[PDB]
Amino acid sequence: SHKLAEANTDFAFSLYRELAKSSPDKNIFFSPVSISSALAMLSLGAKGDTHTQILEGLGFNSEADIHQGFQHLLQTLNRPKGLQLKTANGLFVDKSLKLLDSFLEDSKKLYQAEAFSVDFDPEEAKKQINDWVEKQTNGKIKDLLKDLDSDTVLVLVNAIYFKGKWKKPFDPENTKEEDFHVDEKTTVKVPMMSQKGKFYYYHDDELSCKVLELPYKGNASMLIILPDEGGLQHLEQSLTPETLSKWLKSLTRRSVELYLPKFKIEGTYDLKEVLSNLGITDLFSPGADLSGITEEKLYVSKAVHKAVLEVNEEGTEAAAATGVEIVPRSPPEFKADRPFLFLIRENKTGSILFMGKVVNP
Numbered sequence: 001s002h003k004l005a006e007a008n009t010d011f012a013f014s015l016y017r018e019l020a021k022s023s024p025d026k027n028i029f030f031s032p033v034s035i036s037s038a039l040a041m042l043s044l045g046a047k048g049d050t051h052t053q054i055l056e057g058l059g060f061n062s063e064a065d066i067h068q069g070f071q072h073l074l075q076t077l078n079r080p081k082g083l084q085l086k087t088a089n090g091l092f093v094d095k096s097l098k099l100l101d102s103f104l105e106d107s108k109k110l111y112q113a114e115a116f117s118v119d120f121d122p123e124e125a126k127k128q129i130n131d132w133v134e135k136q137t138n139g140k141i142k143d144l145l146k147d148l149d150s151d152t153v154l155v156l157v158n159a160i161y162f163k164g165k166w167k168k169p170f171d172p173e174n175t176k177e178e179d180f181h182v183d184e185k186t187t188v189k190v191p192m193m194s195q196k197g198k199f200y201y202y203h204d205d206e207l208s209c210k211v212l213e214l215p216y217k218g219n220a221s222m223l224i225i226l227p228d229e230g231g232l233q234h235l236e237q238s239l240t241p242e243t244l245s246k247w248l249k250s251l252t253r254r255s256v257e258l259y260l261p262k263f264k265i266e267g268t269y270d271l272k273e274v275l276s277n278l279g280i281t282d283l284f285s286p287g288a289d290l291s292g293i294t295e296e297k298l299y300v301s302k303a304v305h306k307a308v309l310e311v312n313e314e315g316t317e318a319a320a321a322t323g324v325e326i327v328p329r330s331p332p333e334f335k336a337d338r339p340f341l342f343l344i345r346e347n348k349t350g351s352i353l354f355m356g357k358v359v360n361p
Contacts, residue, residue, distance in 0.1 A: 004069040005350040006241045007059030008036050011278075012343075012352040013239040014059070018274045019267075020236055020357070027334035029267040029356040030307045031160050031320035033077070034087065038158035038322040039275075040070050041089055041111040042283075042300075045103045045293030050282040057278040071110040076349055078112075082218020083164035085346065085353070088136045091115040092129050094153035103293050118155075122148040129155055133321050137161045140308050140319035147327045154298065156324040162344065162353055163317045164216035170195050170313035175262065180361075182335050190360070191262040193313055199258065200251035207235050211247045212256070216315065219347040223247070224260075226340045235341070244343075261360045264310045270328040271303035304328035309356065318344060318354050334359045 012032030019028050036058055043054045044067065052062045060066055077087055089111045093099060099115075107113035116132070118125035126148045133144045136159035145155070170193040180188040200213040208231035214222040225247075227235045272284050282288050288299035304327065307320035338361045344354040 001069070001072065001349060004066070004073060008033060008073075009241040009244060009350070009352055010059040011036055011057075012355055013241075014278055015274060016239065016355055016357075017236060018277045019269060022274060023267075023269075023333065025334065025336045025359070027265045027267065027339075027357060027359050029265045029309055029354065029358075030269065030305055031318075031322070031354050033073075033351050033353055034158045034160045034307075034320045034322045035271065035305055037070065037074065037087065037089060037111065038156060038324060039280075040066055041107055041113060041158070042156060042290075042293075042324065044106045044110070045100070045290050046283070047289040047291055048282075050289040053280045053282055057275060057280040067106070067110045073349055073351065074112060077346060077351060077353075080219055080346075083162070083216050083220060085160075085162050085164075085220070086136065087158065087160040089113040090129075090132050090136075090155075090157045090159070092118045092125070092132075092155040092157070094118060094125075095120065097153040097294060097296060099154075099294050100292060122150050129157070129326075133157060133159055133323075137319035137321065138163075140317070141306055141321045144304070144306060144321050144323055145326050146329060152325050153296075154293070154325060157326075158322045159320070160353065161319045162220070163315070164218060164220055165315040166313075167215040167217050168195065168197055168199075169315065170260070172313045175313060180337070182337060186335070192259050193262055194257065194259045196255070196257045198253050199256050201254040201256055202247055202250045202252065204247065204250075207231070207238050207243070209235050211251065212258070213251055214258075214260075220353070221345055221347065222316065223343045223345060224340060225342065229338060232339065260311070261358075262312045263358065263360055264308070265333075265356060265358060266308045266331070267306070267333060267356075268329055268331055269305045270330075271305050271322070272300065275303070300324055302327050307354065309354065316344065320354065337361060 180190045202211045208228040210226045290298045309318040339359045
């Protein structure tokens with residue numbers, strides 16, 4: 001479990017850096033465990049360099065056998081206490097495509113994959129897929145698939161949903177609107193929540209940032225990391241599993257006056273591009289070896305990740321979906337200002353469920 005967590009966290013931060021690079025002055029929000037799960041499931045059916053690249057890109061040794069670890073992780077994530085947390089894997093299969101029985105069986109057993117034959121009418125298939133994603137995300141990820149092409153014969157989706165109440169909720173009567181001057185012409189009124197209390201906290205002098213843990217009731221926490229002004233690049237380039245471990249071991253209980261915006265953010269990413277920079281290339285080319293999925297020629301021509309979050313006085317609600325063979329869109333994100341980073345972590349496994357950068361202050 002610990003080794004899997006290390007790999008998945010290395011992936012979270014490596015992916016975060018690629019996202020930050022490709023979307024420079026922008027809010028970032030994503031579920032690294034969602035993406036890891038989808039790719040690990042896909043890897044059941046990959047061979048050769050296609051397979052090696054996926055494993056290494058995910059943070060594993062090329063000869064690692066990861067699937068029982070993922071099975072255990074996903075089973076554990078799906079058994080929360082005191083909060084809502086669920087993740088699901090779906091396979092949507094055109095009736096003209098024969099999947100290997102081994103892939104169906106392995107994905108069902110190890111990834112709890114739900115497999116469906118979709119309709120030949122692409123509008124009906126789009127509704128089937130989107131309705132499944134809405135079901136897995138309590139309606140928070142809507143219209144994931146916008147395009148659907150009749151030649152697409154396999155869609156693979158991982159979804160995740162989280163809703164937690166703060167252990168120490170904010171009193172809404174202490175929330176106060178502050179004028180946030182986004183640019184020289186634009187002012188945004190931000191509701192700023194506040195509370196005084198004793199929280200696990202650390203000032204990281206080396207990375208020039210403040211680290212605060214906000215626990216949920218039940219088995220998760222949010223870790224908030226506020227870089228000093230001008231310290232963001234150095235912080236981002238220093239994010240590693242070891243840094244996270246350092247932070248967690250270094251937190252001590254301190255009296256603090258906490259100001260946190262009430263906010264909502266979304267991220268939508270073209271994953272094909274991002275994953276290529278982590279070395280996952282063959283998967284996205286006609287030469288891909290996905291012969292463990294089907295005998296038919298298959299490769300991944302498009303992939304999306306979509307994630308949404310709401311933080312308020314009561315707690316946090318977040319959801320995400322990773323769609324293999326779904327076209328990404330590029331909606332507006334973050335005009336731009338000083339930011340903070342955050343992680344939503346599950347307690348038992350240490351899994352990074354979600355990570356963000358909010359050009360909030």
